[PDB]
Symmetry: D3
């Protein structure tokens, strides 16, 4: 099941991302249940917003929010919920929400799957519009959810994203 | 796998619904296979009709038709096949088909997932148009399937739906 | 062409709404060109937001922003861009943007098209979640567009919406 | 505008069909307004049914129901509302509704647009399942609309469809 | 999980097909991972082409390309990735790609699921346009993928398809 | 109607593109009818290919193929058929088909509509994958249409695209 997918072929540069929410999708937040491996509805979002990229996580990791570290994966067409994509990290949006520190990695499809994102080497290669739209999304999607909130710290580079991947794999390994 | 999802956190008022068929979908009836847990095509529907809400079942239950008890779940946007939603029962359409007694529960997203349906407390709070459209769907979707048929008994309240949930959980527990 | 559609059969209670943007749509703002009658792209929206209802205008009206008065029309399924729907006003979100006073009417499908919205008589009959989501949308969709902004005044009733319709028809008639 | 499209290059064998409702679409009945040429919502359908093929009419015709003669056009992918397709009639479903005699032509894409339907020469070449699904749709889609109803007479051949086209063109020419 | 689905109720005439890629879908090639059973992205296709039918495989088989034997399944509406459909083989496109011999079976929905394809008894009953479109797809979809290629041998009949099914089941049984 | 839209606010650098075919769409080629202004089906495509960008033309121009000059417009989300987008030319694919010389301009959304494509100044700024996919599409989409064919000459720069725009406007002005 999805519970058995590796974190990656060669962390932190070569990772697998389990997708929970497609790009260009309806405003439903899904989460994989750690017990059954099934996709559960987590929230019907109350704002008229949508996840700006495909969204999911790296298996066998843990952020301080108590869930696997989160990943945004840009693709040319939306991915299937519950599918897995091999990717390469290029940057990270550092942020906190009500559940704890809650970084959002950005990882692009690995070169073996497509040449499209090979030119994206680091965070400055991502489009400025996309990065601004992502930060705005996280800043506002919980605006009508009482007791839920976000504080964005800012964008950091690929080396920072890789360090976040390492830290989150260690946290899961260790407790 | 989906075979391992609970019936609910606190039956009969707090249930999990495994979705087989999204709302606003093409006329393909899917069913979860009790052996593999995979979604199988059950029928390519022969009438130009669509399931009026998301449609699925409560795990670890059994109706007299030999399958888990059926649930319709209204949502603001269609759910993913094979996903699970926490819900609260509000009413039931009593009916029989060629395979046996075959009630259709209506359960709304739980308050933890959305406040949208909190105002729906009982069957009279569901829109009359929706209830009529649901009964009409079940009355007619098998009209071109020889040997398949439906007899609708009528709509009953949340207490009746909860009793149906209890009865169907007991039937599975007991044989 | 669309340029010739009436404001309504019997303003202000019985109106026609020309739709520019469907519900559940991609973040592209279209506007009907007053010269050709064709749908033009007005903006590729920069936030990850979507219009919360179908969106358009009443022909042969003018708001202080220099465009026909705006309307949000809730429907069970999204409408086609460039199509016209007969509706009945039920409320209005008073607001201003950088182009001028810019109220957003809410009008529901007329009883001749559906009985679904007959129960919505006035602004308090609209769902609270929908009204909050609409105000939040207008407050934020221009957050990444420099020099574009919104100030929301608040929700008002059906009588206020009808007065806005009358005022906007007079403004177009008179200049 | 659409009001100016010919009935056909060479009636009754070579016709143009103006599409109002796509195949595989949501349950919204649209109609072209004879005054403005714009697509208006005619009804939000109350049954959970969908038009089984693309649906529209032949311009410059009139059925006894007071509207242009109706056409169902099978295609490999749904057509755009308000678009026009060159077609060839292959059969007709004779029927009446509350507004008068109201035949439903079936016409396939002309050979110049595709070779796919060249093999469909007459009504017996249409799939039996499709013909049954079409009749069932018309029999039932108005089942929850008070005062609206259908009586189906039955399927007739291409020669009957051509005669219906001629008769309906004459009715419009003459009054 | 999907890893446990039978090859079929009664091979080679009565098979199960696990779907990886829907019909009418975006140009993303998915593959089920033999370890986890999860759907992985295999390639973001570089040509502007789409799989002409639903596409997947028969479990517990092996082609010379090292993967389960491939199947195209025509349906009236696209199937869900990861779903299973009971089918009947009607023909096969013999071909090789860079990974080895790589036949493409065509199997239609079994009569128990629909009567629609009962009339398709053998390869000559498939539409000529569909067969040509399928061969063209395989000939060209890898045209921009360096080192990936296809050589089509040609279409063969249902008996040939059944022999391919038997051979591929034996190959998996034996190594 | 669309027949009245300008070629552009300031040709050749500031143009309007009338869209016939959305990006990410089904394989139906539409064309605006020069008589009625309505969208007609031109072909049901026989290959399993899709237009790689939104596709349309500049009004009041003529290529040697006898139709207005063609334009591909990349956007973040597909455009509506029959809608108009203000754009800026960045390159051109020189090619011929059976009807005559038939260049394909590439023009991006104007800066007034979005900042997304401001960085695309010239043809080398377009992604190599996109340019290769476009050429491959035109090379192959007519492969199953007898008597229809394409010969691609190759990609040229923004200055070449502007010259093509000027030439095509003159051809329409002059005959
Ligand atoms: Cl691991
Ligand atoms: Cl978050
Ligand atoms: Cl890589
Ligand atoms: Cl930012
Ligand atoms: Cl349980
Ligand atoms: Cl049933
Ligand atoms: Cl609840
Ligand atoms: Cl009822
Ligand atoms: Cl008026
Ligand atoms: Cl606004
Ligand atoms: Cl009304
Ligand atoms: Cl509010
Ligand atoms: Cl005519
Ligand atoms: Cl009718
Ligand atoms: Cl023909
Ligand atoms: Cl029939
Ligand atoms: Cl087996
Ligand atoms: Cl292949
Ligand atoms: Cl069979
Ligand atoms: Cl062939
Ligand atoms: Cl001009
Ligand atoms: Cl061309
Ligand atoms: Cl520009
Ligand atoms: Cl190229
Ligand atoms: Mn959306
Ligand atoms: Mn969470
Ligand atoms: Mn997460
Ligand atoms: Mn969070
Ligand atoms: Mn998190
Ligand atoms: Mn549908
Ligand atoms: Mn069943
Ligand atoms: Mn069931
Ligand atoms: Mn049943
Ligand atoms: Mn049942
Ligand atoms: Mn404006
Ligand atoms: Mn407006
Ligand atoms: Mn405004
Ligand atoms: Mn306005
Ligand atoms: Mn009518
Ligand atoms: Mn009609
Ligand atoms: Mn009628
Ligand atoms: Mn009629
Ligand atoms: Mn492979
Ligand atoms: Mn395969
Ligand atoms: Mn292969
Ligand atoms: Mn293979
Ligand atoms: Mn597509
Ligand atoms: Mn042409
Ligand atoms: Mn053209
Ligand atoms: Mn051409
Ligand atoms: Mn051309
Ligand atoms: Na909040
Ligand atoms: Na039946
Ligand atoms: Na702004
Ligand atoms: Na009726
Ligand atoms: Na290749
Ligand atoms: Na050709």
């Amino acid at each position: 099941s999805l519970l058995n997918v590796p974190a990656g072929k060669d962390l932190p540069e070569d990772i697998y991302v389990v997708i929970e929410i497609p790009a260009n999708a309806d405003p439903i937040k899904y989460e994989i249940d750690k017990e059954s491996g099934a996709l559960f509805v987590d929230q019907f979002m109350s704002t008229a917003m949508f996840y700006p990229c495909n969204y999911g996580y790296i298996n066998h990791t843990l952020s301080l929010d108590g869930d696997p570290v989160d990943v945004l994966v840009p693709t040319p067409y939306p991915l299937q919920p519950g599918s897995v994509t091999r990717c390469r990290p290029v940057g990270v949006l550092k942020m906190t929400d009500e559940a704890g520190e809650d970084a959002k990695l950005v990882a692009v499809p690995h070169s073996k799957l497509s040449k499209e994102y090979d030119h994206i080497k680091d965070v400055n290669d991502l489009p400025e519009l996309l990065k601004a739209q992502i930060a705005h999304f996280f800043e506002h999607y919980k605006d009508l959810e009482k007791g839920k909130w976000v504080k964005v710290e800012g964008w950091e580079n690929a080396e920072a994203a890789k360090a976040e991947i390492v830290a989150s794999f260690e946290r899961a390994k260790n407790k």
